[PDB]
């Protein structure tokens, strides 16, 4: 909150998690997500205001938003690959490879549709890191200091669009459009969470203790 809009953006861009590679389709996706979670934890600690929160609140936020963060990251990575989802540079999945897992292709379709939406809106990297930080902070509120940070990212988003050359009317319109996407990202997460728990109960794939706990919170 003592950061400028440009400092806010630069700090978020600098805190970006690395793109990992993949090492049984569910096995590959589970293994990838598990290794990504560790890098997500360190990422969250670099999100302005997150370490200021009580540790109990930090747990709760990550438990609620971890799949949303993985999904929006995936959607961001797949923007330059239409009709495909880039889980990893060595794991570029076309739509039809979602048919490999039961009830997976409709999750892919929503992820692909989200990527095309970011593409049509010409989403910027600066806007992306803001949206991802918003997800982390907002997705567990309805379960003071958090809302003032959220208002800071809102100011930051507006500053970006104003700096990008958008008129005042285009700013709050685009701001609305970006935040309305988070509702769909929320939807995908809940469906993905139900699917992941479905795979766990059918013994489709072994889950790490970290992932088990992530599912338990839902």
């Amino acid at each position: 909150l003592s950061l400028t809009a440009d400092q806010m953006v630069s700090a978020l861009l600098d805190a970006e998690p690395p793109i990992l590679y993949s090492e049984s389709m569910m096995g590959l996706l589970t293994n990838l997500a598990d290794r990504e979670l560790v890098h997500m934890i360190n990422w969250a600690k670099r999100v302005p205001g997150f370490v200021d929160l009580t540790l109990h609140d930090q747990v709760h936020l990550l438990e609620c938003a971890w799949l949303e963060i993985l999904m929006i990251g995936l959607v961001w990575r797949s923007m330059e690959h239409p009709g495909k989802l880039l889980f990893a540079p060595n794991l570029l999945l076309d739509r039809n490879q979602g048919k490999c897992v039961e009830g997976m292709v409709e999750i892919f379709d929503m992820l692909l549709a989200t990527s095309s939406r970011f593409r049509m809106m010409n989403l910027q990297g600066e806007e992306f890191v803001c949206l991802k930080s918003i997800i982390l902070l907002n997705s567990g509120v309805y379960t003071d200091h958090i809302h003032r940070v959220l208002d800071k990212i809102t100011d930051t988003l507006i500053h970006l669009m104003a700096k990008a050359g958008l008129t005042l009317q285009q700013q709050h319109q685009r701001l609305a459009q970006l935040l309305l996407i988070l509702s769909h990202i929320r939807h995908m997460s809940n469906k993905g969470m139900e699917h992941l728990y479905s795979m766990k109960c059918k013994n489709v794939v072994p889950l790490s203790d970290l992932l088990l706990e992530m599912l338990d919170a839902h």
Binding site: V38, I41, K45, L55, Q58, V59, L62, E63, D209, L210, E213, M214
Partner: peptide
């Protein structure tokens, strides 16, 4: 407790 420990 699990996550509770990587934020140490």
């Amino acid at each position: 407790k699990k996550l509770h420990r990587x934020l140490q």
